Amino acid sequence: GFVCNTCPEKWINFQRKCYYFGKGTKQWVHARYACDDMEGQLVSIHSPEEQDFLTKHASHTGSWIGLRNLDLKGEFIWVDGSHVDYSNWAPGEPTSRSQGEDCVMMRGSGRWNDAFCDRKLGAWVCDRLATCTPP
């Protein structure tokens, strides 16, 4: 169970995860289901090296990621339930005064903006666990 770097076709490995860079115009919840129906989830990001890997492959015109303010009251959490131990917010984000802007996108710089969930974006990123080579 020693080496975890195998992904399915069309996915890209980085560390112990596989990532799928989707293209196609979708609102946040729609991208959420595209990822689930391929057996991953909208991406969660947990380190600067993971962020750097995403920034190099990310779409220039913005991508949905798996961060959402779930519950009115300003606390953004990952769809996969993993915890928030890393953040790459654009300066000033997320703001208190933006009622309704509960979903998160990653810009071409890789920095994160909150967004209305019904915004349509051209790209979205899924992740899943890499499987491991038997030695």
Numbering used by the authors: 157 to 291
From the paper:
The second principal receptor for IgE, CD23, is a type II transmembrane glycoprotein with a C-type lectin-like domain (CTLD)4 (3, 4). In its membrane-bound form, CD23 consists of three CTLD “heads” connected to the membrane via a trimeric α-helical coiled-coil “stalk”. The interaction between CD23 and IgE is critical in the regulation of IgE synthesis, which can be up- or down-regulated depending on the oligomerization state of CD23 (2, 9, 10). We have determined the crystal structures of the human lectin-like head domain of CD23 in its Ca2+-free and Ca2+-bound forms, as well as the crystal structure of the Ca2+-bound head domain of CD23 in complex with a subfragment of IgE-Fc consisting of the dimer of Cϵ3 and Cϵ4 domains (Fcϵ3-4).
